[PDB]
Design a protein around this ligand. Sequence first.
Ligand SMILES: CCOc1cc(CC(=O)N[C@@H](CC(C)C)c2ccccc2N2CCCCC2)ccc1C(=O)O
Ligand SMILES: Nc1ncnc2c1ncn2[C@@H]1O[C@H](COP(=O)(O)OP(=O)(O)OP(=O)(O)O)[C@@H](O)[C@H]1O
Ligand SMILES: Nc1ncnc2c1ncn2[C@@H]1O[C@H](COP(=O)(O)OP(=O)(O)O)[C@@H](O)[C@H]1O
Ligand SMILES: [Mg+2]
Ligand SMILES: [Mg+2]
Length: 1166
Amino acid sequence: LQPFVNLLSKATYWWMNTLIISAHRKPIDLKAIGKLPIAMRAVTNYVCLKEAYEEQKKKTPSIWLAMYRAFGRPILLSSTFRYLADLLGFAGPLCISGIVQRKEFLENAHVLAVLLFLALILQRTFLQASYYVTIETGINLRGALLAMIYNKILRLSTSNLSMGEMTLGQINNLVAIETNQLMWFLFLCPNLWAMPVQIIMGVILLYNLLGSSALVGAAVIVLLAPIQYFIATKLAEAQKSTLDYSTERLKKTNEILKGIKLLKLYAWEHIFCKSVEETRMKELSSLKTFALYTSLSIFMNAAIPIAAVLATFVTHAYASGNNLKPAEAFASLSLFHILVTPLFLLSTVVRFAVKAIISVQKLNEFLLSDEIVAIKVTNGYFSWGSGLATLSNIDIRIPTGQLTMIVGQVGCGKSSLLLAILGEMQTLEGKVYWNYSVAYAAQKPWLLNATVEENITFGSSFNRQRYKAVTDACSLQPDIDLLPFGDQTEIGERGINLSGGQRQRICVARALYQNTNIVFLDDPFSALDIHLSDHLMQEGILKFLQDDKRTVVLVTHKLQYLTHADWIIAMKDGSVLREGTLKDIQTKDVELYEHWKTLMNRQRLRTKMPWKTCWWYLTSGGFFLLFLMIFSKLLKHSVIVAIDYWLATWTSEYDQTFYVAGFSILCGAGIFLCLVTSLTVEWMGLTAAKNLHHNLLNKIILGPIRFFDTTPLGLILNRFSADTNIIDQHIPPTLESLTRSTLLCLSAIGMISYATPVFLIALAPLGVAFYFIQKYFRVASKDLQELDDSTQLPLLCHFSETAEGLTTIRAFRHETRFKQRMLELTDTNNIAYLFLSAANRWLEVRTDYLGACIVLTASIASISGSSNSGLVGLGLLYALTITNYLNWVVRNLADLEVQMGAVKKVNSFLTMESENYEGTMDPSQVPEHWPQEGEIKIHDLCVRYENNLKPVLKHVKAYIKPGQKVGICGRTGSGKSSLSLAFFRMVDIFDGKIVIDGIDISKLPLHTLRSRLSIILQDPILFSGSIRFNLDPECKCTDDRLWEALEIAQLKNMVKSLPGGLDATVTEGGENFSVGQRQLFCLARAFVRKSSILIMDEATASIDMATENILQKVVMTAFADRTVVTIAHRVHTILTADLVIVMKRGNILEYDTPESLLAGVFASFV
Ligand SMILES: CCOc1cc(CC(=O)N[C@@H](CC(C)C)c2ccccc2N2CCCCC2)ccc1C(=O)O
Ligand SMILES: Nc1ncnc2c1ncn2[C@@H]1O[C@H](COP(=O)(O)OP(=O)(O)OP(=O)(O)O)[C@@H](O)[C@H]1O
Ligand SMILES: Nc1ncnc2c1ncn2[C@@H]1O[C@H](COP(=O)(O)OP(=O)(O)O)[C@@H](O)[C@H]1O
Ligand SMILES: [Mg+2]
Ligand SMILES: [Mg+2]
């Protein structure tokens, strides 16, 4: 008995029942979901797939044959289950015919009801078993493919010829999408054979039941596959265009958020809002065609069946002597409902098959890519794959336990020599003799997305003693302390960015820490200060490494410390000039030794569905559209039910002109209302998306700066990228499907109840059962989706990590550890996805048994209760129909809940408070040339960044003469920038008042105040587009004024050199210019602003010495007339000022002419 009970448990997915039921007390964390059975682990699947692929390559090799030889048996079994399911499912129409007409007990009309019940139960059990088996094999294939491509990545070659700039993109695409497309094709694989057979058998059954008149309907419906494929192609094209425009919009939005403070200061927030709204309008224009084609798809899907039914029954009435009997009519109707789904989804199956062919071609093209005392080399020619000898005639020697520095000119080949030693380059000749893992500090530093502690340890055992030794020797303890968490701090692309010097120091620390006898350091001092380099060499290279008697080779152009080098390698143009000790080199090569000296001298609580947010989304478009949607859908479903009831009435009898006319009118109304409802739903979706995004962008850009400082930019960009995409594309189709399924189920229930009143007694318990299933599945699946996504993200992150810095991994010999990590991550992701699919199967099976119970009850009650044969057929038809949609209603309800979560996020963002833009003072009281005078005063200023915080500035009072140069200085965190922000009003004023030109700055429309004031920040920021755009996006000044400003800033020559002059394009972040160039561009912007007041915060900061001097000259000359308030670090510049206000942790402190306070914290700083 036990094996049979276990088979039943595996058939109804009872093993997921406990998990789903426990999804209430505690969310489903990874502990609840056990580990994969050894059969489904990624290691075994990878072994099988690799074995098959190698067998293929034994005799060009095809991934298709390897995949078949690996996972053909599971899919063959799934196909067998699918065929049995189709055969049993065609017991619906046949049994409907038998029951509607009514030793051989099969015609008793009661045994047929229980036969229908059993056949339906077996059909759905087999169908769900087939789905689960195909999904299991698909996930196994995804695991195997990920492991195989990861091994190839580990075995890739780093030559620029093969691993191009887009190689990382290709690998990431393979991991993310291509493998997913192949997995989905595996999921849908049984359909490619199950659906054509089902369609052919359905058409044959229609022909047998309904005479030759079934051919017309069969052809009309079969025309539904080409149409669906055509509109699917159109949808793909429209979605590609929409994604392009959305990417442009998101680039603009990200640029806006990154540097919001500067935009708000410069009153350019609304200009960039208009710029983003232009791209949003284009995206909505594209989405209009996308939604039009989606509406056409839904209209075809819901209308072609009705047109086919109309044609079939008109032809049968006007071309067959016998009248339309009830049994045959409703059997044909059920067969049409059965065949509509295969014909609609065959297009999707074929589309995925084509995409999988493309994906496999891409994967194969990738897999066919280029790959591959202490140390002595002899007669070694190394090439990067081109064929030319990049390095020739190498006779290098690296004595054990000694320092061997390799020096040469740039482009010499030193890094190439190290990589060749590591085996990353093809060895045309020669050999490399080892007398094992070697620590490698790549010339380009590489850091994992893990924490600093893990990155520096890099998998080795933690030793606080050695950790501190390396950190102090690396001089990284201060930079570590400055981190928000110190150790255990996220870094890398996703983590907190670090300066290049910090990254290189981290990499050098990693190389030093690990226990290896050979250490390869390549230009560790490229991004380090002279003092930092000296400390690193004296403490780490000389002492720390010599303590363990390790072997170190250092590649650096800094000839300094060449005396400390036990061995020296002189290389030039890919060839060793001389190798040996400094004294030996000088004795043998006097010229070289003297040459180096020349360079030396040079210097769960909540689970309720969000109904409030759902209603808010529904009403967002407008009450008229919502009313039209509801009315159109109700009228369409009433017309469809009327069509079926009119069919029943027509078949009741047993001339036909009246019935045919009425039926044709009803079918025409049905198709017209299908079109109307599709258009209305898409219209509502479009209006909702437009309104929501418009309001969200406006509110966010108009919000306070404190919000931007608090909320990470990641969250806001996610609200603009993921939530916006959901609202645009996923919500409308999901709502359409949910409403269609809900109304179909309700109409079926109502029609069954009317035809068979007794059905309500058995409907009462099934309602409770369905409610419980709905609740439990909704919560469980909502949790499992989050689990799956959170598990998926680290997998792509790890693939990106391994793709980069491959040389570091293969130099540490830590490839095995990374491979094991990948196997663990992919196993976790696969188990998460598999259990999500298992929850789906659980729900589907329970709802299938519920539908079987509904069908049994409806059949028995209708047979018992006398009724028109047509009415009995109608009841049975709807009892079969409700079964197919009971599952989809709940699944779409869960999806709608998930998406209303995102809409709730957007709504919450809409509720953010807005800055007090409105100014108390009358606009008419603000003269146009208000800031011309330059008069400025302060009255015990007290500014707090946010309420309930200690005042950054407290009781500051000062007077500034018109057209006067004022200076500001102080130690870090002294509140210097607080005064500037108060000037601009961005930072709220806790107490006091500031008067500019005899007006209260606080009591003014903040836009006017911001526009007519000039501010320069520490790091210059440039916005994408033309130079003219950056000079004045408002376009409220003559073009020649821009040339005058450029000439004043001394940038006229640079602009002229670039093509197009003022129209020369500019890249985000100033990548098209040097830092000094960006700073002088900002200075030119301030000049063209003609504010007459200049505020500078670290203008010289991050500025070249020549850049600093030219900026100082420009400030002295151009802005002489206008007031200048300088907040700088170097006191040198402020010396030329006439009034300096130094502050210390909230105190006006010193205020007098530079000489006045020199009669003395200022003197100490100077
Ligand atoms: C992650 C998807 O894993 C599945 C995988 C399957 C296997 C499968 O050949 N389905 C047929 C549907 C059957 C009823 C015709 C199909 C065909 C084309 C497109 C999508 C689909 N299906 C995929 C979802 C959209 C409609 C049904 C079933 C169900 C699932 C599932 O979600 O649980
Ligand atoms: N990964 C690579 N793939 C292909 N060719 C490379 C690669 N790295 C360097 N080369 C080429 O090999 C030759 C020497 O490269 P190498 O890395 O030694 O440059 P370098 O400027 O001497 O380095 P360093 O920064 O250490 O001074 C040059 O032709 C360089 O273009
Ligand atoms: N966005 C902010 N929100 C709240 N407080 C801040 C913010 N920025 C700086 N502060 C606080 O204000 C004080 C003054 O810093 P400040 O003088 O502006 O720095 P800097 O010298 O770099 O200009 C600091 O001690 C800091 O903690
Ligand atoms: Mg190099
Ligand atoms: Mg500052």
